[PDB]
Amino acid sequence: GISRDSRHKRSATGAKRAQFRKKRKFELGRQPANTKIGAKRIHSVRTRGGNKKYRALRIETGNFSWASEGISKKTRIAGVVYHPSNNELVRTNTLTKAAIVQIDATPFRQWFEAHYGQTLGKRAASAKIESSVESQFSAGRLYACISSRPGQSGRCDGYILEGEELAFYLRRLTAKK
Amino acid sequence: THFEDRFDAREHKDRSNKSRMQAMEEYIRESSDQPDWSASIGADIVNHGRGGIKSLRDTEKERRVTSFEEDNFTRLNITNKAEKRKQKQRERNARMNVIGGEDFGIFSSKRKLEDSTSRRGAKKTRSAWDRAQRRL
Amino acid sequence: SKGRKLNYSVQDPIANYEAPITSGYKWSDDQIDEFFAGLLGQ
């Protein structure tokens, strides 16, 4: 089976030691959920004790926040455009923690214009929001960072990027483009 | 730093019966001269004389198991392995050491008395001023 | 490395796991060689 023992790595001396015991139950590693994007199908796992751990294998909708003014809504994801671990992962669009996604702009701009009254792009000081932010408002496609383990929580939480974060990720995309 | 601070069960336990050294116990009985609480003759002899009288140790052990009954109010039983072993050993030593109720394996043994005395033994005198203080 | 570097070495469990196979060509290889030359390159 799939274990997470140390009973196979080399010693710090640099030699191979003896086999100790048959591999147990508690030292187990379960099967990795390559969570794709789609019709949300959740699967429950009974872990040690009576603990329930959820693995959603697909999803459309995640919970996203701005701390720019502190709002958070459930929205529909659109796509996977960056992730620091694996280019193949980014390619086949299997979302993970710390993933960079394109997300819809529609309910957020609806709230913004229903809360301020000012059309995006095209409370005055708070209405002067960031220029790249309102450009992505005009584009209708925002950049978010999924910052939650999906294959543990069975949830998908993200926050839309801000200045230096958005700056480095834009630089990453423009260097990789 | 680092240490343990645990209950010294073995040190709070006793070893006096381990270090008892019977010949000089007999002497210190003679010197400290309290009368002895010895028994009468029928209380002594064992089994229509098939065995010896008894040893003085065996008098003590019987008195103590009778005390277990005295307070604890329960007896022993016919448990196989342990009492067969102990009964055999004690009877073999009865037929090989005790003659007429006193024992001589105490001399045929090899436990010395200097390992008890040891020129004051524990917390011994090893300095000249310690000699001066003990002499005064 | 882990597996990136091409450790060219014989494998015992797949030594004769599918060794050998009879040459099931449905061709005689000769006109097909002329034909592969006379493919879209010509």
Binding site: - | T1, D5, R6, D8, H12, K13, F68, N72, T74, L76 | -
Partner: protein, 245 residues
């Protein structure tokens, strides 16, 4: 093995019961309960071995659920309820109480206790913490979790609790110059005033204690229980004052 253990030999019994070695082959395992097992006393030992009120296990079960023994106010129905250190066992049919306290030889000792002194029990305050709804709860050594305590209660304290209602009454904060009761370590059973403390973060907080032969000695802070000041105990201690001759 596959889990916990349920049988245990006579020889492996903890010392502070002071048993024989061949009453049986297996010892009464303590039930899991309000005291740790390595420091607790089961009632069958208390009522079979020590006070000789009962002499066989079925008999002591018969009395226990004739429902006479009351522990810590409440009544028990366990053959192996884990009574612990500085605790209260009363009995109505003899009209008596017993505060259980450690001796100098590292063994338990009953104390014959009258009704009003048995009305209260002290507790080593382990820790207080802010629970839900922002309320405070205080936890002693013996699983005692009490809402709304004194704010002056800190960790490592001692609180006297009346038992007729399970409610805190009095408190003493450990400071320098207190009447300690040593409970663990090397030097269990030597009761006197403390000297002081050495602090060791990432480590231990040693306590120097000077007992009535004016002898100091060092013990772990975790082994500390607090009684009071010098010359005034809150417990009717027995004769001996924690002195071994």
């Amino acid at each position: 093995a596959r889990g916990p253990k349920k049988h245990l030999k006579r020889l492996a019994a903890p010392h502070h019961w002071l048993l024989d070695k061949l009453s049986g082959c297996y010892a009464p395992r303590p039930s899991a309960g309000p005291h740790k097992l390595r420091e607790s006393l089961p009632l069958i030992v208390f009522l079979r071995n020590r006070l000789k009120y009962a002499l066989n296990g079925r008999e002591v079960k018969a009395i226990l659920m004739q429902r006479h023994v009351k522990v810590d106010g409440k009544v028990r129905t366990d053959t192996t309820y884990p009574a612990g250190f500085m605790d209260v066992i009363t009995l109505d049919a003899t009209n008596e109480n017993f505060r259980l306290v450690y001796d100098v030889k590292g063994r338990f000792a009953v104390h014959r206790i009258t009704d009003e002194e048995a009305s209260y029990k002290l507790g080593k305050v382990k820790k207080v913490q802010l629970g839900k709804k922002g309320v405070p709860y205080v936890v002693t050594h013996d699983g005692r979790t009490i809402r709304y305590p004194d704010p002056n209660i800190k960790v490592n304290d001692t609180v006297k609790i009346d038992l007729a209602s399970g409610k805190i009454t009095d408190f003493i904060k450990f400071d320098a110059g207190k009447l300690v009761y040593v409970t663990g370590g090397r030097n269990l059973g030597r009761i006197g005033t403390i000297v002081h403390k050495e602090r060791h973060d990432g480590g231990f907080d040693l306590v120097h204690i000077k007992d009535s032969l004016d002898n100091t000695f060092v013990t772990r802070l975790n082994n500390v229980f607090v009684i009071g000041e010098q010359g005034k105990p809150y417990i009717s201690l027995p004769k001996g004052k924690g002195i071994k001759l």
